[PDB]
Amino acid sequence: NYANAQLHKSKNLMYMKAHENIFEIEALYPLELFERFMQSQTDCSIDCACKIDGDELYPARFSLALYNNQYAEKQIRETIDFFHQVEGRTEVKLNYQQLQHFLGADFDFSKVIRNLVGVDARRELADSRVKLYIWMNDYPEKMATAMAWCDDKKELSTLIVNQEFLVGFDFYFDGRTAIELYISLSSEEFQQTQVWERLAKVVCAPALRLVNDCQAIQIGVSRANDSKIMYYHTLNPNSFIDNLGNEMASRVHAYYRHQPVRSLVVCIPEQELTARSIQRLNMYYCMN
Ligand SMILES: [Mg+2]
């Protein structure tokens, strides 16, 4: 985006290092290799994130949105190469069968609109992940494949109104894998009467009522999800966090409230919104 690519990358790394420093996670593998991977890219945008699970916090979470989909194929090659570099430590072994099966032998890289690369580093090495997200547009054969592999209940097929879809690949360091399908709805889209009526047949009421507080939502479905995951692109980050009644989320946002943030996305499993209190959620702070 910005003309001074090298200035912007310096700010990216400074955003990541801050996040690692406040949460005291900098030593987790493979964050240093991820930092180097960032710097090897032409330019990208960073999202710093934290996952909340009861009393536990998993804040070693970062995503890079790689600029210029003209080079989507090369980006995936260099991402895979970075995953192999992470596999440099002997007790880290990834399983690529889901990615390989999804791409097939003649993947149309001209259909990719955005690649994203992620990490969620854990104290328990076996639980850590690297992540690849492939954002696609107007690719009906791959969309149907993703729906068959991720949309058990055939619910996202009743909700989508654009040709874009996001396919996320999880690579656990002990060889576990998961694939996830995400679709998006802007405020303009989900405020249309028929679109909203379709939402209301698939999304439980407490999760649906939250959609109104948003400039956009995404919904992620996966065999590895215990319910649909709602991604709330918050209109007012401060009030959205306050309305969660979650002490740890308020503590996290207490720092970021006064930070130059492009947007705050909060994702909550549908099942959490039918409980007495929210205890599981992710917060993504997408930096400028
Ligand atoms: Mg997921």
CA of 147 to the centre of ligand 1 (A): 15
Q: Which helix (H) or strand (E) holds 72?
A: helix 72-86
CA of 220 to the centre of ligand 1 (A): 7
Please answer whether residues 60 and 121 qualify as being in contact, where contact means their C-beta atoms are separated by less than 8 angstroms: yes
Angle formed by the axes of helices 31-40 and 5-23, to 10°? 170
- What whole-number distance in Å separates Cα of residue 152 and Cα of residue 82? 31
Q: Residue 38 has which token pair? A: 């960032």
CA of 6 to the centre of ligand 1 (A): 31
Q: Which helix (H) or strand (E) holds 49?
A: strand 44-53
Number of folded domains in the chain?
A: 1
CA of 140 to the centre of ligand 1 (A): 22
CA of 167 to the centre of ligand 1 (A): 10
- What whole-number distance in Å separates Cα of residue 109 and Cα of residue 151? 23
Q: Residue 274 has which token pair? A: 């039918």
Beta bridge mates, 114: 135
Please answer whether residues 232 and 199 qualify as being in contact, where contact means their C-beta atoms are separated by less than 8 angstroms: no
**Strands 164-172 vs 177-186: parallel, antiparallel or unpaired:** antiparallel
Tally Cβ neighbours within 10 Å of residue 72.
22
Q: Which helix (H) or strand (E) holds 119?
A: strand 112-120
- What whole-number distance in Å separates Cα of residue 146 and Cα of residue 271? 23
Identify residue 192 by its one-letter amino acid code: Q
CA of 181 to the centre of ligand 1 (A): 9
CA of 1 to the centre of ligand 1 (A): 27
Angle formed by the axes of helices 72-86 and 31-40, to 10°? 150
180 is in an annotated binding site: yes
| Residue 128 structural domain | 5-287
